[model samples]
Structure formats: structure tokens, C-alpha cells
Target chain A: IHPRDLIAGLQKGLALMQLFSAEQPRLSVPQAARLSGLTSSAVRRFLLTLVHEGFAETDSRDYWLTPKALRIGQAYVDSAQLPRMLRPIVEQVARQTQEHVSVGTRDGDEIIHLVRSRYSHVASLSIRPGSRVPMYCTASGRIWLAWLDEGERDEYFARHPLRALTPYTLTDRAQLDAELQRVKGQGFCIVDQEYEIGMRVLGVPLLGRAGQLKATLTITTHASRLSIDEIRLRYLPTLYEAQALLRPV
Target chain B: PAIHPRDLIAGLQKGLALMQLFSAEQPRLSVPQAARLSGLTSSAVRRFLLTLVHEGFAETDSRDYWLTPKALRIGQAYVDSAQLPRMLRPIVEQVARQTQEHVSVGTRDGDEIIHLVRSRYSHVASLSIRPGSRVPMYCTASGRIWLAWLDEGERDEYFARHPLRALTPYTLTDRAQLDAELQRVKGQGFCIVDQEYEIGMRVLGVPLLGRAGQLKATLTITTHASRLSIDEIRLRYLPTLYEAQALLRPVL
Candidate 1:
């Protein structure tokens, strides 16, 4: 892939879009420029182009994403065979465990759920296919960290520091190191109230038939419903069953 | 309101449009198929598909190309970043729990209705309807509600762009019948479709209004026709759906 083959404008537009988040959905030109490290004039052009394409809306000063942005991801979810193949197996896991089950893979610094099956009525962002969570603080994220090789793990730690999302979230390197070692040995991760206040999650890696990493299968439940110990004893085999069913051929 | 040529990013727009050509009906496409849909030369389409491959958004086995889950990042950006959807989820969940049906919120995107948020209680509930699901505007309840409020000129423009096709026997494909149906929906302030899209699937939709009373999105409840009739759904579930509508109007 030569630099000449890539479209610079397309690259810049996508890079500019990565700056918006739950904390900062709307951005002014100068603010976008500061965050994206592009010039204000350039950011303004990109914002206007987004508006023209119906991807965003602006109110004189601030610009925000519209529902059309979802179509970009929908194109992938609707067309990709990975999510289609995993949904039936995910549904079985959800029914067996009586909890929400999701298949997620790491994308850059975050874990994006590719497919989901829900038994719980509560709708959290983690269960949605197009929603993403941080790679430093989720059960799926921990699975990702545990499986990474030493050089890649060093690069990950160097690039992203642990930020406390909840009181029980592990923030120290030594703590994370020890936890990863345990998780690696167990072949699964049990995150207790780390991402949210009362949520407990059980995560397992889905290895392909050729022994390559496929995705992570996560079961989410409330602490009141089941403690981490109870969940491990009860649902670990269910997740294992689903994981084995999905070796991605 | 004309944008300067220098201000536009033409490649980004075209590239994204090319990606949209893949769907459930045709998940993988050859370079020629993409070229025909995108109106670009086959050579140019090949280059675009290769560019997507380079970015990890797409993959090819030397002949045909398909999207990868990595392409979901751009759409996930909207969900992770949008404030309204994060707020709207609880409201949708409440409706789903109260009705024990699949509830979704969608906005119009071209000739299709794109689901932005969806919640379901049943395990077998319309497995295809997810956060980014899309459906034809002529067949679904959400699409009818959106079509009901369009101005005459815009409606005519939509008619010109979209050709009526039958997905099921109940679909009102005739322009006169569809016009009368649209008028009835607009007058009643709600829309219900009886298996217009798929057999045994029924849906009821209401317009979600913005602060200015403009149609912002459509809120819909989809159910199995075998279990419930049109009248049963309207009487038993309409009030709870209205409650969600009321809750969302002030915020959206």
C-alpha cells in the first residue's frame, strides 16, 4: 500500500470523526481543531462536508453527529458474515445463562461488540453491536490484554494508561499485571464492578480452529443476581460451550 | 449555500457510498458490481475496494470483496459519541418491557429507515432488527410514519426517487392507495402495517417530534401477527408507546 494509493481527504475526514464521544458530542471548529490537531480552517471544511453529506448537523457554532453516522457501521453489521454466524450461538448462551451475551473484538484502543443476545431487560451500551468500550477497563478488554504478546502488551501499556472508571477499577500497573497473569492462566476474566457500579462480567476468549484469536464472548449480570464466584461456577461452562461452537470455521 | 469545490471531500463521500452497496441480500460484491452501482469504472472500484482492504474495513480473496467487522468503528463512533441515543435507550427499554415487544427508534436515510436504537424482550424477537438495521420505506410502519409528514413537494420528490415494489401481499404499492393510506396515517397521528414487509410480522409506529414539532424520528413496536392483531396492539400497547413519545418529545 503506497501513500499515493490512499485518498488523503478520506483519511482526514475519518480521523476528524474519531474525536466525538459521549462526553463531547458537539464540537465547534476551533475545538475540533484542537482535539484533532488539524487547523481550524481545515476542521471547518471537514465539518461542513459532513453536514453536506447528511452525517452531521450544525447550529451556527457547534456541529454534532446525526443518525446517518450509524449507517456507516450498519453497512458492516448488515453485510459482515462474522456477526451473522455468531448470533444463533450467542442467543443460546444468553438463554442458558439468563443474561446478556456479546461477542467483541478490540479495535485500536477500544472493544467494539460485533453481535449480541439479550435476556435482561436493561439496555446498556456494552450490549449494542455498534457501541464501543475502552480497552483498558472492560472484561473483554482484559481478555485482550491477557492474550497479547509481551511486545504488544508493552506497546499497549505505553500508549494507554489505566483510568479509573469506577471505584473498584484497577489503576496500578502492578495490579493489572497480576490480574492479567491470573486471567491468562484461567483462560477467562471476571470483572467485578470495574466498568460500572454494580455490574459483574464474565469473559472468555474464542479461539479459531487454527488456534488464532477470533473474538471474546462476554456474559453480563448484575451483582445482586449473581456474585463473581457463583457466575464462574454456574455460567463458565455455558460460555465455554458457545465459544467452542464458534471457531469461525 | 453552495460549498466551494475546495471545501468538499469528494473521495470520502464516494468511498462511504461504495461501502453502502453491500447488504444482507448481497453481502459480497465483485468489482464490476460495485462499479455498476457506484457509477465508477471497474478499475476505480477496484482501487476503492483495495483502499478499504488497506484500512482493515474490507477484505477480498482476489475476486470478490466484503466488509469486515472493523468497518463498524465509524458507526460505533456515532453510538459512543451521541448524547441523545444514550438518553433514549432507557425510554425505549421501558416501552419494550411494558409491551413485551421489539421497540425501535429510526430516522429516514434516503429511501430507507435506519434503526438508531432498539430494545427487545423476547429471545426470538426479530433477530435482524439491531441498532443499525435498515428497511424499505414503503413496507415498514416506521417508514410510513416518516412518509406521512413529508410536504407535497418533498413527497413527490421521494416518489420520483423511490419506485413502489411489493414485499408482501398486503403492501400498498399503488400510488392512489398509498396516498390515501398516507393521508389516513397523517390524520390519525400513527401508522400500523399488517405484514406489509414480512409475513406474520406487524408493526405500529408513531412520530417522534423535535422541540420545534418537526418529525425527528419514528418510534415503532414490532410484534408477531399470529399473537396479536392490529386492533389489539393499538388498544393494549398504544398508551405505553405514547408515554415514551411524550418523554422523548421534550428532549429530542
Candidate 2:
């Protein structure tokens, strides 16, 4: 591999590219620059270079990212280092819940989707592999936040300043703190309409055999149509069984 | 300072040209292969691939790169998130069932029409509109309907700007005549073109509108021109398409 220092921009460009998705599909030059912490002029030059080379495109000045950006995630997902160590947990989750299940890693404050079992109707709503979600507002986020270092978690909250997106969004720090505590106490979380108006999410953090925070498992559904009680009765048992599937290595 | 950057559409255009490099003839490519196919330098191609790899949109094995599972995300996010594919699914299915011909749902992506979803009868695979393939915006029944739906200014601007390459003898290469045909397409809410892109093929296209009436999707039924007459397609397919569009809103 090239010296880590020589490839810093390549690494940052890779990281910055992941932030573009269906929900946040298009980015302005300035927005991409701000998000990636690259200067606008630099971002513009890099983006044009990307377009000229055929990896990305700009619609007017707004940058629209394309699927050609998935290779890095595939390489990581396919790495024997992570997937082989975590496959069983994913399988068990799918078998138990019979619902779509996903495993993801925390990249800073965002949850990067890793592996998933295609659950027919439910799987369709999921953040596809290579998609990311905010850490402050998701079950995966909550589980991860609860598992973080105290100082790290505090700094994260301070930086994120959790914005209330919906009427049900948790805005108060104390309220968020209580939820985090509750998750730590119970080891699981089921949140409804806290992020999107009609969506519900449940999560459990993985404590690898090596004592590493390997990943988090999440199951999501539409709340207006699916009941919390139904999920508890039908889904919770499966979620618990999935814990046994993760490999310690 | 430059009033506007080089061009608003350059990014999208270059990206699309890269997509054009992906065809049945070449499913996977190395850096040198891609550079040759797209006319970019190898170093530039490497950076583009690396960036695409980062986005989870493309994947590679060893030295050969190809589109990944994430390839469907763009179509999924645009059609599923907006509920377009689900809404048009039944309409396309009904048409397939009725004519025993291939049917599809497409949306305009810049100067091209991309088929987001399609279902083909067993015998129609050779003639089917495969999902994710882009057809030209100046030919085909689908292209005509898309062109017809645009305002006069946009239509004139498009023809004046873009060259209409003839794919076949019947392709509408004349800007003046093609512009005149828009009025008929507007009144009928459909377009039928024969052997424009491929020999012996006939296509019927109907524009699908969103709740607010912006063109959101399209219904395309394709058959051999020998098997289906233009009037027969309109008489048989129009009513079914309208009924499907009616129920499309709630699903999407």
C-alpha cells in the first residue's frame, strides 16, 4: 500500500463520497466541500476531475453521486476480517425475527450498513449496503451511543445537538440521556416515529468475543401499519436469538 | 468570476457517458479498459473508479470492476422512495397480460429515458425493455411522449441544441416535422412509433403524471410492428393505462 500520508485525500474522498445517498442524493459544491471539510474550490476541482473521469456527475452545479461509488464498501464487507466474524449473528437474526435484519458499524456518528438478509416487504425500506444514517436519531444510533466512551458520547451529543425532526423526535438532552440509559439497562431499544413519521426501529449492540464493539443489528418497519405489540410478540424473540450468531474472532 | 461554471449539465453528462460504457458487450473493465472505452486517461479512470467504489455504487474483484448491488439504489431511491415503480407495476403487468407483449415503466433522466421496471412475456425477452437501460429521448414512442409533454420552448430548445441521430429509417430525424407531431401526441395522451430504434418493432407510450400533474413516470408496451397495429394499440392499451394511473397515487 502507498504510505498512508500520500493517500489522505483519496481516503477522505472515499469517506466523503459515502455521505451521498437516496435521501441526500444531490449535493451542492459548497455542501460537499463543507461536509467533506475540503475547500469549495478544491471540491469543485476534484468533482470536475471526477466527472471528467466518469465516476460522478454535476447537474448544473449540484453534484449527483452514482452507484459507481460502491467498491470500497464491497471490499470492506467482503473482507474476511469482518464478515466471516459476523455472519452467524446476521443469519440467526434473520431466522429468529423472520424480519429483514441489518448489521452496521459506527463510522464516527454515522451507521454504515454492512450485511443484511433480504426480508421481502420489510427489506425494501432498509438503508441498502453503503447507505448511512444519523447516529443521534436511530435505534442503531442509540445502541451505539450507549456503548460509546463517556467522554466520546458527551462530545458527540455536544456536536450533533440532536435536532427534533418530527413531533415525536427527542429534543431534550435529558430525555435522550434517559433513553440511552434505558437501552444500556435493557440491552435493546424499540423506537417508533422518533425519526420518520411512519417508521419504527429496534436495535441491539454486538459485543464481539474479543470485547470489541463489532456491530449493531437493526430491524425496522412502518409504525402506522405495524403495531409495537405485534413486533414485541413476533420480532423480539428472534432479535435475542441473533446474538448467538456473531463469531468472536 | 465566471458567471456560471462551465455548464450545469456537464457532471451529469460525463457520469452518463461513463454509464454508457457499461453494456452487454463489456460487463466488467480494468482501469486501462475503462480508460479506452470512455476516452479518459488511466489515472483519471482510477480516481473515478475509486470514488465510485467509495460510494457503494460500484464494486471490483481483483483488477476487474463492475457495477455493484448498489446499482439499483438510484432507481430504487427515485422510484421506490417516490413510490413510482409500485404504482406503475400493475399497469405494466396488465398490459403484459393483455397483449402477451413486453411492458415497462420508464422515467426521463435528462436526455434519456430510463426503464425503471419491466415485465416480459416468455416469448418477448428479445424485444423486452430491460430495467436500467436508457433509450434515446428523440426517438421511440416513449421519447415522443416525453417530448410532447414538454412546453414548446423546452421542446424547441431541445431540438435546436441536441443532434437527433437516426437509429433506423423511421427514426424522427427532422426537427421541424417532429415538432409538428407534438400537438397530436398532446391530444391523444400517447405516441406510437414503428421500427424507429430497431427493425420490426412497434412501441406505444403513455405519460404518467404525479399527484400534482408533473410527469412522474411512463407506461410502454412493445411488440413487433407486424403483430400490433398503431390504432389497435391505442384502442386496446389506453383505457387500461388510465385505470392503472388512477390507483398509482396511493401505492407510491
Candidate 3:
């Protein structure tokens, strides 16, 4: 009858979710404590119950979060709550930038676009919701790459040889290294005449409260319309402000 | 560390086992049938079935315990949320339309193949292929593609444990001949089989791989032999099927 007596039915679901964050997609029982703030015994019971329900999977010794948890995330998004939250931000960003503004997250080495507020001028590039782009070459890719853990970053580079897409695309290891260093120091990346002819793109990374890399928010436009400096001067502030608004969610 | 060492009742594991016993044809099982299938005592199986029935995932009539609609959610969540289905559905649809055949996408699960998405031919033949339909790896064209991918040791181990179960006269049943056929499929990118499952139902299977070369799905197109010939299938169907596989590479 009491909530604490056994984590209750739905609280068990919540406790399992609390184990996940952007930085720590995988968690063990002890780490679950730091994330969920539950007693070790309580979290253990909740985890075991989740294991039974196929909401979680475990290796021989360690517990790693699986896409099994995406059930709840998909259910929430399917009801269109996430898009509703994005409408105002998307509109404001598109209006201010006068370019195609998109919100996306890094999945492996690619950006999985979550939102795209297109300006009529630049909307014909054929990208849309759920678009995946290479991280090493795209401005959005570098922002997330700068924030990615060394192991995760290495995994991305290893999977992709970073072959040159355009003359400006970073294909060599040394070039990719120097570009990442510049990105880390500058807090954003800008590339012109890359990915497409006359295309210019800038990206800024989003950091969650615990210094975890959340996602990269970007604005892409024609190189002819805006110089690299103009984009940095005018749109950078708006991107940061949008990041502030989105970090809590 | 906290240890709540309650002894695991054997029935608990057996109850979970019953959930895995369902297939496309036999989605329902009687108490005695499930007990025999799972190698558990009938009384013990009954108790497990009753527990699942209580959870609303399993529905039981007097004769048999049938899987309820709720049970589909288990597999549906993975298929629906994943990028594979989104990139795959349109491609599968286009291939099916061009070939005028049944096209299916299946991912290997343990020893069996579980279909994730399919577009079927409603006119020429009655083919009941839906998501969650499980077919044996030895009897179907898709299964041969999977069989060909496995290395020698794994292939031997699998064949050793599970004897070939023939569904029809055309089904490949002999060990030496099946092994030889699998080698040929490995060399070729596609497999064409005629009347392996049912008479006049011809199937062509091509394996779709992920970024890592792991088999993500099997692009299988099935047709009736009367409607199309072998050369027509190679000319019209193979190119579209290959395009569908290529389209999936970037996103999925």
C-alpha cells in the first residue's frame, strides 16, 4: 500500500529512467544510486524488476542501458509533446537567423535531427527530421565531437575513414585533429564551401548540468548571404540563448 | 552490496519460457501442448501460463492459451522506434510493386528468423507474412542467406543441434546438399528457391547488412512461378532489391 514499501508499479519505471543521462547512457547499480538518489537496495530491486520486464539488459557482470528503455521515450514523442515544445523555439530561431535552424543530437558519428525550422530561402537542401549527417565534416558534427568522450570519439573516427566529401572536407587525420582542436578552443565551428556549394554552417554544443554533452544546435545558410564572422557575431548569441532554454528539458 | 537471496522458484523461469514458445502459425498453445513443447511438467506449465494470463499478456480459452494483442508491444517497440523500419518500409514497398511479389525483411533471432516488416502479394497467392512471424532458418530463402553468412564452426554447431525440418518435398533436407547449397549462396549475392514452403510459391532472398557488415535484415521477394520467370526476376527484381539495401546503408 505504501510507495516506499516496494518502489510501487510506476515508480519502478521512473527509477529505471533516472539511471540514464546524456553523459552516462550506461550505468551500473552504484552509479544508479548517484543518478537516482535511491538506496542501493531499493535501486537493485527496481533494476531487477526492470530486467524481468525487458526494460533493461545486463552483461555477465555489468549492467548497460539498452534501447529497451526507448519504449517510454517513443511513447512520449508519439503523442507529439516534443514537437509542441519545439514550435516556439523553432519559430523564434528561424525568424532571427533567417536561415534553416535545426536541433539535433549525435547518434554514433552522425547527427540525428530532432527539429528543423526552415527558411524558404534555404529549405531546398533536402534534409529533414531524422536526417543523419557525418560529424567530422559538418559543423554540427564537430561541436558534438569536441564534447564527446575520448573513447566515443575514437569509435566514430574509427568507423568512418573521414573520406573527403568536398575539397574543404577534412579527410586526413592531422587535418581532422587540428579542426577539432580549433573547435574545442573557439566553442563553435564554421565551415564554408563545404558539404555543398555556396553552403555555410555554424554549430554550438549544448552542455547539460553535469557537464554532459546533450546535443548540438545548428544554423545553416548560403555562404553568399553571410560571412563566417557575421554568423559568429549575429547568430552565436541566439544559439547560446536557445541552448539555455533547452538544457533543462 | 545488498543481497535479497530469495530462492528462484523453477516455475518462474518456466513461465517466462512459455512466452518464447509462440510462432506465426501456433500463437496459441494448450496446457499439455505447451508443457510438451517446453519440456516442463503440465501442472508447472499451467501455473506459469496462469501467471502470464493474469498479466493480460496472454489470453486463454478452455482449449488453449492464445497470445493477446498486448504481447505484440514487446517486439513492436523495437521495430517502431528503430531507424531500420523507417528506411526499410518504402524501399520494401517499391521493390514489391515492381516485382509484383511478396517482399519481407527479417532479422535473425537465435536459431529462428523473426520478420520485422513485409509487404505481401494479395492476389496471386495467400501468403500470411506479418511482423513477428517466425520462420525456420533451414526451410526459407532468407534462412539460407543467414546460413551462408555464418562461419564454418558456427554453421556446423547450429546444424548439429537442430536437424533440418522439411516443410515440403522441395524443402532442402539432406545435410550434405544443404551445406553445399549454403556455400553457393555465400558466393552469390542472391538466392532463388521454387516451391520450398508451398507449391508454386517461389522466393528470392538477398541479405542486407549494416555498417559493420552484420546482417540487419533479409530482403526476400516471393512470387508465384506462373506470373514471372527466372530471367525476369533477375532483370527486374534484383536491381530494385539491391537499391533498397543500398538506400538503407546511410541512415539505418
Q: By DockQ, who's the top model here?
A: 1
Model 3, runs deviating above 4 Å:
A1-249, B1-54, B58-69, B120-132
lDDT of 3 by residue, B1-252 (tens): 322434222333344355667654455689899888899777667766666565545566756876543443343444554445556777777776676556788767668776656763322122222222467787678888998999999888889888987777878789999888898988888888777666666778888887788776788887666667888878888888788777777765
lDDT of 3 at B134: 62
Candidate 3 — number of clashing residue pairs?
0
Candidate achieving the largest lDDT: 1
For model 1, residues B138-211, the per-residue Cα lDDT tens digits are 77888878888898888888888888888888777899989898898889988888887877677888888877
Interface RMSD of 3: 13.3
List native contact recovery per candidate, as a fraction of 1.
Answer: 0.59, 0.00, 0.01
Q: Where is the poorest 10-residue window by lDDT in model 3 chain B? A: B123-132
Q: fnat, candidate 2? A: 0.00
Number of colliding residue pairs in each model: 0, 17, 0
Residue-level lDDT for B108 in candidate 3: 74
